[PDB]
Amino acid sequence: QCVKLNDGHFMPVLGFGTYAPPEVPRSKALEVTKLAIEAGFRHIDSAHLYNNEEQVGLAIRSKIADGSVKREDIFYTSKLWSTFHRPELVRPALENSLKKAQLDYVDLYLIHSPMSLKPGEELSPTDENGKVIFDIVDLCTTWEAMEKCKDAGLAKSIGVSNFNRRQLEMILNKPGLKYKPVCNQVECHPYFNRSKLLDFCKSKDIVLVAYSALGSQRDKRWVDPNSPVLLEDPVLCALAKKHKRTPALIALRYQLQRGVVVLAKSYNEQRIRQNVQVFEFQLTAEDMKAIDGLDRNLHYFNSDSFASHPNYPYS
Numbered sequence: 001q002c003v004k005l006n007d008g009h010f011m012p013v014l015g016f017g018t019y020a021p022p023e024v025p026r027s028k029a030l031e032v033t034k035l036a037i038e039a040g041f042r043h044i045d046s047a048h049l050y051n052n053e054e055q056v057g058l059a060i061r062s063k064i065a066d067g068s069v070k071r072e073d074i075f076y077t078s079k080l081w082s083t084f085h086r087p088e089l090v091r092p093a094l095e096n097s098l099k100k101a102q103l104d105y106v107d108l109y110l111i112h113s114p115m116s117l118k119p120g121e122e123l124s125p126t127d128e129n130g131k132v133i134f135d136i137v138d139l140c141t142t143w144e145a146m147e148k149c150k151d152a153g154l155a156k157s158i159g160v161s162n163f164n165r166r167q168l169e170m171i172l173n174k175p176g177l178k179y180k181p182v183c184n185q186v187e188c189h190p191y192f193n194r195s196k197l198l199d200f201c202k203s204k205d206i207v208l209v210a211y212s213a214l215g216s217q218r219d220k221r222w223v224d225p226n227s228p229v230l231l232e233d234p235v236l237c238a239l240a241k242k243h244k245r246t247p248a249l250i251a252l253r254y255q256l257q258r259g260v261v262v263l264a265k266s267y268n269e270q271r272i273r274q275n276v277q278v279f280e281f282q283l284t285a286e287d288m289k290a291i292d293g294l295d296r297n298l299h300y301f302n303s304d305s306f307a308s309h310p311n312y313p314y315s
């Protein structure tokens with residue numbers, strides 16, 4: 001069901017990933033989020049980046065209006081994009097997300113990345129040669145702005161995404177810190193299992209929330225097509241046959257058993273309904289040891305565009 005966060009709120013441990021690339025019509029997010037809620041998802045992950053908060057928020061409002069759920073049964077996350085890290089831009093960015101979703105509050109607002117970008121409206125601002133333009137912002141000042149958003153009731157909880165241990169430590173040692181991040185949402189799957197980061201997070205009562213837990217959507221802009229496809233891994237597929245489940249269910253169950261909250265994106269009705277079967281079976285200790293053996297420090301988001309940024313979290 002849910003895990004209790006460090007501020008006393010509750011996060012469902014399976015969440016629905018809503019990002020789809022620009023080639024997927026915008027209206028599909030409305031349909032699939034309704035299907036996710038119908039299947040049993042109660043945690044729904046969006047972002048200003050995803051150009052879908054209006055569609056996702058409509059799906060949530062539709063399922064409330066038809067009696068299927070109450071607003072307090074849904075855990076909705078959005079995120080502060082990287083051109084809005086300057087503290088004066090944080091509350092307006094959250095207000096804009098609330099307006100788009102037509103919601104009074106989000107359950108969770110995250111700093112989407114530590115990789116600050118030039119302030120503006122351009123999502124990935126670029127110069128002449130096409131180099132994205134970076135910004136230098138003290139993230140503890142952005143964090144103070146997030147904390148005021150929690151005080152105002154615009155976000156029930158606040159946290160971060162894509163932070164490494166050092167960047168989290170910077171927040172946690174902030175003079176006059178009011179709220180710790182509840183979570184750190186990061187790439188995490190059996191080829192990049194983040195065990196050192198997970199240990200650090202558990203020692204700080206911070207939840208690690210795994211994205212790209214099924215191996216990412218393998219978007220051309222940032223993904224090497226040579227990278228092994230997580231769900232074609234022979235150990236995952238052998239465990240799927242052993243349990244008569246599927247490689248995606250093995251990869252999601254692995255996270256739950258390590259105390260990681262797990263996201264899963266699918267825009268396919270059958271796979272959405274499949275993925276909630278993660279609560280119907282268990283992996284044994286030998287199974288978990290087999291999956292730990294797969295770790296290969298492979299982050300699918302792997303581009304020069306990210307790696308050249310001064311606050312790139314991987315090293």
Ligand SMILES: NC(=O)c1ccc[n+]([C@@H]2O[C@H](COP(=O)([O-])OP(=O)(O)OC[C@H]3O[C@@H](n4cnc5c(N)ncnc54)[C@H](OP(=O)(O)O)[C@@H]3O)[C@@H](O)[C@H]2O)c1
Nearest residue numbers: 017018019045211212213214215216217248264265266267
């Ligand atoms: N904070 C960040 O920087 C960040 C970054 C990346 C992702 N995220 C969040 O995490 C979500 C999930 O990560 P992701 O988008 O990278 O995708 P993912 O959850 O790793 O899924 C990868 C692919 O798996 C497929 N799939 C889903 N269920 C399956 C099943 N049962 N069997 C087989 N294939 C299956 C999906 O294709 P179909 O749609 O065709 O089923 C999907 O495109 C995102 O949507 C977003 O909400 C956040």
Ligand SMILES: CCCCCn1c(SCc2ccccn2)nc2cc(C(=O)N3CCCC3)ccc2c1=O
Nearest residue numbers: 022112113114115123124132162301305306309313
């Ligand atoms: C359809 C819109 C395109 C989405 C582009 N995008 C962008 S563009 C901004 C940009 C470009 C270059 C440098 C910094 N920032 N940055 C992201 C950043 C992270 C993140 O923090 N990571 C990735 C590896 C290490 C940590 C995750 C996902 C994305 C993403 O998907």
